[PDB]
Design a protein around this ligand. Structure first.
Ligand code: HEM
Ligand code: HEM
Lengths: 181, 181
């Protein structure tokens, strides 16, 4: 199954280190994040929030870009990658009104998202989930995993992305730093 | 809400004229199709199947094509559009493994999906729903509406699409012809 849930509450595989409400309404601080694949009948109500999103096909990356990405992309679930960051993202209506060529021009031709991200592989593992189509308050759920030696590089990557043209359209963003249990 | 459900059963707004099982397993023949804006978990006891999908953002149209479609696309529920066709589609895994430039090259440079379809606007209203990401048996639900005069034109359009390179990646297809009640 391609559906994933992120439950903010008192159980989970990850301990919340901090939450940084970068832009827009934030997320209440909780003790742990519970990650679930597929639907489960019971998710605690004593939980604070529940995000979700699905893995999907490629939307912008071209073939040569994939080849370069799959050649340095690390796997999730590395013993050393005891730190994780969940960054839900929402883009503005203005971004979604645009055609495919206009969004590709902004995503890569101007902002070089993928060329910038490749500099931080294989130290940082990154997965993408889509959730605009589910009516979720966010449009994406980005997931990052890496060893603590890469914390400075990752914090540098965040600031690079936020200074790009593509992030002029982001109107809601939160950082949920996690430590593995 | 951007979710739509198509209940094949004994109730609904549309009367099933015929179902043609074009490619792969088909859909049981029913009396009517009931269309609901929203998801439907439990399905009426008198129903035979349920299809669902969501309206989403553009995945392939460049802005020159989008402005042409939007200036010509007709509404839904035209007084004369008493015929409707529901065509669920499923593409192969080889298609979903490809990158965005590869899939776009086939979708337009080789098949001319948008250039071909535009010839049959404004006669035929056309709406696209996505459902691969929900885990449905189909990848897309396509919805058409037209007056009986444009029924032959629609059938020619179908011939053209099915002879394109894009349709060599299709592995399941069914036609559910409908009449407005
Ligand atoms: C090593 C670091 C990174 C790499 C290799 C990378 C690569 C990519 C690639 C190739 C895509 C396109 C996916 C597709 O075509 O469907 C993408 C999408 C995306 N990335 Fe990243 N990225 C990185 C860092 C980040 C960071 C730090 C964030 C947020 C802070 C982020 C947020 C997003 C979002 C929101 C999308 C969805 C774009 C859209 O559909 O509008 N990425 N990324
Ligand atoms: C007037 C006739 C038609 C027009 C104007 C038209 C237009 C379009 C456009 C512009 C797209 C791209 C949407 C996007 O970029 O997200 C598309 C996709 C699609 N069309 Fe058509 N089309 C027509 C006829 C048909 C027919 C007859 C079928 C099936 C028998 C069909 C099946 C599909 C499918 C399955 C997709 C999704 C392709 C994908 O995402 O890989 N279309 N159509």
């Amino acid at each position: 199954n391609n559906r994933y849930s992120f439950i903010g509450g008192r159980t989970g595989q990850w301990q919340v280190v901090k939450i940084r409400n970068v832009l827009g309404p934030g997320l209440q601080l909780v003790e742990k994040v519970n990650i679930l694949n597929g639907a489960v009948a019971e998710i605690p109500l004593d939980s604070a929030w529940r995000l979700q999103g699905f893995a999907s096909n490629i939307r912008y990356a071209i073939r040569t870009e994939l080849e370069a990405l799959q050649a340095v992309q690390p796997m999730l679930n590395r013993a050393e990658a005891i730190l994780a960051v969940l960054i839900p993202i929402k883009k503005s209506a203005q971004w979604w009104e645009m055609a495919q060529d206009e969004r590709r021009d902004i995503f890569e031709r101007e902002s070089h998202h993928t060329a910038v991200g490749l500099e931080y592989l294989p130290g940082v593992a990154k997965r993408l989930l889509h959730c605009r189509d589910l009516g979720e308050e966010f449009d994406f759920l980005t997931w990052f995993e890496f060893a603590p030696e890469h914390s400075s590089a990752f914090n540098e990557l965040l600031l690079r992305m936020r200074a790009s043209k593509e992030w002029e359209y982001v109107e809601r963003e939160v950082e949920v730093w996690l430590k593995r249990l």
